[PDB]
Design a protein around this ligand. Structure first.
Ligand code: EB8
Length: 133
């Protein structure tokens, strides 16, 4: 038989929402600091780039990524959420950061380059979190 299963193909899932009109939202001084200080200082770091957008599992040849990671998160998503005033409190935003870092540590192994990058960014994140208003 001549069906060789070359289609249908893989794909990326849809990315996390950055808007939700029915979700409760606030602007708080902590959320303001999270955008202006925490996110913007991590964003400029030379290890930020793999984290600035959702994982493209097709481009990056990580076909197992969304098999293993079922709650993806990334800093582009967090940035957009912050810009859109998506969050109710600082905890929600912080949980998104925690999810991003945790995903990285789940998927990868100690000493992998991506893990060294995540560890550095997490260190910086935790320092910046300790001066939250
Ligand atoms: C942060 C999301 N992420 C991963 O968890 C991950 C694991 C393996 C490779 C890559 C990856 N591929 S990459 O080409 O951009 C890359 C980035 C940083 C360090 C190593 C690699 C890589 O795969 O080197 C071969 C991008 C984003 C992620 C990963």
């Amino acid at each position: 038989h001549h069906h060789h299963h070359l289609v249908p193909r893989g794909s990326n899932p849809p990315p996390p929402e950055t808007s939700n009109p029915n979700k409760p939202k606030r602007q708080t001084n902590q959320l303001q600091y999270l955008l202006r200080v925490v996110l913007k200082t991590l964003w400029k770091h030379q290890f930020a780039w793999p984290f600035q957008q959702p994982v493209d599992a097709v481009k990056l040849n990580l076909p197992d990524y969304y098999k293993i990671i079922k709650t993806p998160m990334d800093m582009g998503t967090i940035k957009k959420r912050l810009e859109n005033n998506y969050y109710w409190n600082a905890q929600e935003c912080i949980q998104d950061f925690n999810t991003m870092f945790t995903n990285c540590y789940i998927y990868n192994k100690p000493g992998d380059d991506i893990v060294l990058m995540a560890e550095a960014l997490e260190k910086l994140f935790l320092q910046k979190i300790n001066e939250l208003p």
